[PDB]
């Protein structure tokens, strides 16, 4: 009886998959035949074949879903900061405090190459910088680390160690990733959407 019930379940699954194959095949055919006309133009506006605009900007922001590092987000600031700290450790430079970190961030972000970047990404960068600066402040207040750089135990500076070089590297890497993660004009976005919804 147990073997018969197991065979029943197996055949049920088999027929389910058999119906699913054809059903999803038809659905994919329809979705692709309907969405094969859209394309990303050079002015960041998704337009149909007749010239009508479907979206003034793809996804509201204009980022490539294939180049999405985070969960529906362009970058994971924590991972990028850790990678920058690990790849470029500067032992000959002192650590930065909250005020110094905020000052260098505001001075670097106001450059020309950062003007063309979207405002939301800059606001997210500012929020992450403020968060890490508050964390550094809390750490230094817990361990009484002085911003002057004359504390006797230097190992205390290794808890949250940040140098302006690492800050600049992090900002440049984030900007480059955000610029290279945008929708490249000419891509058949409609067909990609149809396939990603059909599969």
């Amino acid at each position: 009886t147990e073997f018969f019930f197991h065979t029943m379940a197996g055949r049920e699954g088999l027929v389910d998959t058999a119906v699913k194959t054809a059903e999803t095949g038809y659905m994919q055919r329809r979705l692709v035949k309907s969405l094969e006309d859209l394309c990303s133009q050079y002015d960041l506006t998704v337009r149909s074949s007749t010239g009508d605009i479907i979206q003034f900007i793809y996804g509201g922001d204009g980022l490539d879903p294939a180049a999405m590092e985070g969960k529906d987000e362009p970058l994971e600031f924590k991972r990028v900061l850790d990678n920058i700290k690990a790849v470029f450790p500067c032992p000959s430079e002192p650590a930065l405090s909250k005020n110094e970190l905020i000052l260098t961030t505001e001075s670097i972000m106001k450059k020309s190459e950062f003007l063309c970047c979207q405002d939301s990404f800059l606001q997210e960068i500012k929020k992450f910088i403020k968060g890490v600066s508050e964390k550094i402040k809390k750490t230094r207040d817990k361990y009484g680390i002085n911003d002057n750089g004359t504390t006797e135990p230097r190992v205390l500076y290794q808890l949250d160690r940040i140098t302006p070089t690492q800050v600049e590297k992090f900002l440049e890497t984030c900007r480059d990733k955000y610029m290279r993660a945008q929708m490249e004009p000419g891509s058949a976005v409609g067909a990609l959407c149809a396939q990603s919804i059909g599969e």
Binding site: Q41, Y42, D43, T45, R47, G51, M179, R180, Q182, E184, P185, G186, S187
Partner: protein, 76 residues
């Protein structure tokens, strides 16, 4: 000047294909190939050297156009 300064993968592909076809059609080489019998390899070498004499003509949907040099654009 308003479009993205980065050279997309589609532009890369089309430029490489056109240059490979031209080289296969007895076009002059500007990188002094070293035993490369494959035209696509020569095209990739010219792209990496930024010596492809091709200017992309990006058209806007309304009708406006803009010229961008291969050496002027940014490659990855």
């Amino acid at each position: 000047r308003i479009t993205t300064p980065y050279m997309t993968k589609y532009e890369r592909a089309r430029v490489l294909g056109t240059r490979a076809l031209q080289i296969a059609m007895c076009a002059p080489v500007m990188v002094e190939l070293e035993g490369e019998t494959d035209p696509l390899l020569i095209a990739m070498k010219e792209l990496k050297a930024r010596k492809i004499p091709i200017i992309i003509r990006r058209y806007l949907p309304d009708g406006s156009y803009e010229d961008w040099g291969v050496d002027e654009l940014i490659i990855t």
